[PDB]
Design a protein around this ligand. Structure first.
Ligand SMILES: [Fe+3]
Ligand SMILES: [Fe+3]
Lengths: 256, 256
């Protein structure tokens, strides 16, 4: 039968099959170097240059803006009661498209708190390293099977985002640095992803496991692993590019 | 500027521009012959043959099943803050995809109350006249602009469905004919579309008007009119085919 039904708690890796725990293990270094990135330890501490913060906010906009579109494209692949896990996916995507309703507006507000306008977001004047993640996300959402594109997006990106957003919010410095009257509106995107988002990536994982079952082929497993690590590696490419600019910007001002 | 902002109540035609009132007028006969169809006056009265009810339920399944997919495909066309009406559309589609969450399950339950199984729904053994509407809906959702495909679906179909569902429920006969213990579950799809759905088609219309503005080209107007009437005409083709079978089925039993 090969059919998966979770018994243990949603949030624990041990509630899933061995192949799923292996997938988590094989992806863990790719994830760690994003979710512990120096860029985020700096952001947490209010250290980032104006130039880099602006690049970060412009750069990350398209994935945010397009996020419910990735989901829409995956929902479009589904057919009612056709395969195990496919109904769960369809329902989940229908619920979670709505959960994204205001998230783009919250990014616009975060951005504005750093002097980045809607016009600047739309203009997308940032280096190409910063756009690669959105292109990959559209590509897999458009062309890959649902299970792979959900893994790339709702598992990989959302999971990483919950963790880096929490790191940014973890010691109160970044938030206290905003004036009080501006803070709630500026911090809203981060608080929504740092606090409220815990179960989401695990719900996506459970769907992916239900789709794949207890014994997926090695090839399917490799496809999931590669798609997940692609998402993490594009986040890492974006962060590395930002830090190279940070190092330049800060150096110029030390020497001046 | 050409920009539309509604002042009057949502539900009244007079709250919209002249071209929109004209569009309603030009489509009204196409709509009437669906929403007043003899098939529905019969269904209201519990008159339909078993054969036709079964064809109706199998036949109407794909549009129901696929409905949130049509919306998904239109959401995929949208871009944030790019054109007047486009944000309204994006938000609306994000909210309304969730509203459809259980509607397919409710159709499956309605169907089962008439002895039609999930297997029968999936098998789609009905005449080709009954499938044309789903093909058109996918086609416009896949290939036409958002404004046209929303008009074809969320305006035309949902509006017609609110009215025919209300006619079916309007005198209590159809519902009282179900045994009491089965009735709630059997009637749920109909009650959700006959009662709760009033504002939806008018919300879709308002979006379409905001997108088109106060002065759309004649060509855009004709495109909307043709797409709306295509949806109504495919509903009519489906109903006419059902009634031809009804007339045969009932005649055979009168003569026997
Ligand atoms: Fe979000
Ligand atoms: Fe519905």
């Amino acid at each position: 039968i090969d059919t998966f039904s979770r018994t243990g708690p949603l949030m624990e890796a041990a509630s899933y099959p061995a192949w799923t725990q292996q997938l988590i293990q094989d992806c863990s270094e790719s994830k760690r170097r994003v979710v512990e990135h120096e860029l985020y330890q700096r952001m947490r501490d209010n250290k980032l240059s104006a130039k880099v913060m602006r690049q970060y906010l412009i750069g990350g906009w398209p994935v945010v803006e397009q996020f419910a579109l990735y989901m829409a494209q995956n929902l479009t692949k589904t057919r009612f009661a056709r395969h195990p896990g496919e109904d769960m996916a369809r329902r989940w995507l229908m619920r979670n498209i709505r959960v994204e309703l205001n998230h783009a507006d919250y990014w616009v507000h975060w951005s504005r708190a750093h002097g980045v306008t809607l016009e600047d977001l739309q203009a997308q004047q940032v280096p190409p390293e910063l756009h690669a993640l959105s292109h990959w996300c559209w590509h897999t959402s458009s062309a890959d099977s649902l299970i792979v594109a959900i893994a790339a997006t709702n598992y990989a990106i959302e999971g990483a985002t919950g963790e880096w957003s929490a790191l940014v919010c973890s010691n109160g410095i970044y938030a206290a640095a905003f004036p009080e009257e501006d803070r709630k509106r500026a911090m809203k995107w981060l608080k929504m992803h740092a606090q409220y988002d815990d179960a989401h990536p695990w719900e996506a994982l459970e769907i992916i496991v239900t789709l794949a079952g207890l014994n997926p082929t090695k090839a399917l497993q490799a496809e999931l692993r590669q798609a997940i690590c692609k998402s993490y590696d594009y986040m890492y490419l974006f962060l590395e590019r930002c830090m190279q600019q940070e190092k330049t910007a800060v150096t110029r001002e030390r020497l001046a």
